[PDB]
Amino acid sequence: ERAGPVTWVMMIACVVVFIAMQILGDQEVMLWLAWPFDPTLKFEFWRYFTHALMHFSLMHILFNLLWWWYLGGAVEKRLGSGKLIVITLISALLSGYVQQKFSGPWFGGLSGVVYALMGYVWLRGERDPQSGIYLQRGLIIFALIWIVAGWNGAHIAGLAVGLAMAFVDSLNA
Amino acid sequence: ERAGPVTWVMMIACVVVFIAMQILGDQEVMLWLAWPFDPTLKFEFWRYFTHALMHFSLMHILFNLLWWWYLGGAVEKRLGSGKLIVITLISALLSGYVQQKFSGPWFGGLSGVVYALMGYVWLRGERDPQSGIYLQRGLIIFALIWIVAGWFDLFGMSMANGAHIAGLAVGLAMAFVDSLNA
Numbered sequence: 001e002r003a004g005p006v007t008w009v010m011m012i013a014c015v016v017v018f019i020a021m022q023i024l025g026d027q028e029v030m031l032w033l034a035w036p037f038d039p040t041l042k043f044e045f046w047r048y049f050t051h052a053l054m055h056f057s058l059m060h061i062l063f064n065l066l067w068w069w070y071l072g073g074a075v076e077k078r079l080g081s082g083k084l085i086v087i088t089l090i091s092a093l094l095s096g097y098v099q100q101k102f103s104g105p106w107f108g109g110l111s112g113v114v115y116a117l118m119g120y121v122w123l124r125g126e127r128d129p130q131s132g133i134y135l136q137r138g139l140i141i142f143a144l145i146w147i148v149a150g151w152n153g154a155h156i157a158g159l160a161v162g163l164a165m166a167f168v169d170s171l172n173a
Numbered sequence: 174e175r176a177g178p179v180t181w182v183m184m185i186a187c188v189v190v191f192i193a194m195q196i197l198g199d200q201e202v203m204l205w206l207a208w209p210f211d212p213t214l215k216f217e218f219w220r221y222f223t224h225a226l227m228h229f230s231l232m233h234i235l236f237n238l239l240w241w242w243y244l245g246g247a248v249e250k251r252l253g254s255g256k257l258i259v260i261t262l263i264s265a266l267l268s269g270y271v272q273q274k275f276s277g278p279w280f281g282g283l284s285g286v287v288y289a290l291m292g293y294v295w296l297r298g299e300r301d302p303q304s305g306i307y308l309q310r311g312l313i314i315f316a317l318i319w320i321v322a323g324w325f326d327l328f329g330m331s332m333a334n335g336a337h338i339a340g341l342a343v344g345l346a347m348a349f350v351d352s353l354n355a
Contacts, residue, residue: 082273089266090263090270093266097347
């Protein structure tokens, strides 16, 4: 079993983004991918999303990609790539907007999306067991500890998203 | 022209597309602007949004652009273009997903985003009256005489449509969040 394209291309890219940042420096890269930090840049749409692709530390990228590898691979595997992409896009945007709103356009990371995967995977397994998707009991808290690991709101919004779609999804059948 | 840049470009973009669809026919333009309909296109990212650019009838694009211009406008003036772009992006995404999910990839319209702006606008005025934004009581009602003139003043069945609740949810979300700061 190998992880799907979505899950893979995200990991690799975030590794390639960390790439540039280490070399060129955090500053230079965010100058390129950061959430619109000036009106002049407001129409540069990629910015609404590319901020997820940026990490500032070893631990930061390491845990985010582990949660993304495990959750993100399970979702793409059982429910498909489309399901992963949307959860990602919406959660990246929502969280990005809540972050930008309260603390400035200078941030980066795949933690907003991770929290969405945590709320989506966990919720479905609980509501729609047979669906195949669920958050392993042991890992519930390597992650609820990643949920309580931070105490954030730019993380709640993302959780809300995961939770939202998961509700919709365990709402069909 | 008083309407801001976002509001303005979106309307022009919709007219330019509707025209093209007319032309090349709805089929062709969807081919290009429809939510990914085949794995081969899954990574053509514009598609996840561009679906909102297409309309299938005169009355479709009309009321859509009317509410967009009335509502979109207001937001963009009183709250900035950023606020309108993000509302447009998150609601286009969440509502197109729901749609696709339950009814496939062939759709279109700016109705999902209209449900979001209405919800936001309305909700923000009710919670943050002073923010300056609100949905004119009559207007609110030209939505409610309507949820209540298809639901109550009935016609079809119940227009509380699949993709329109997610769109609404988004706006109600961001509104609830913006009326939460102060």
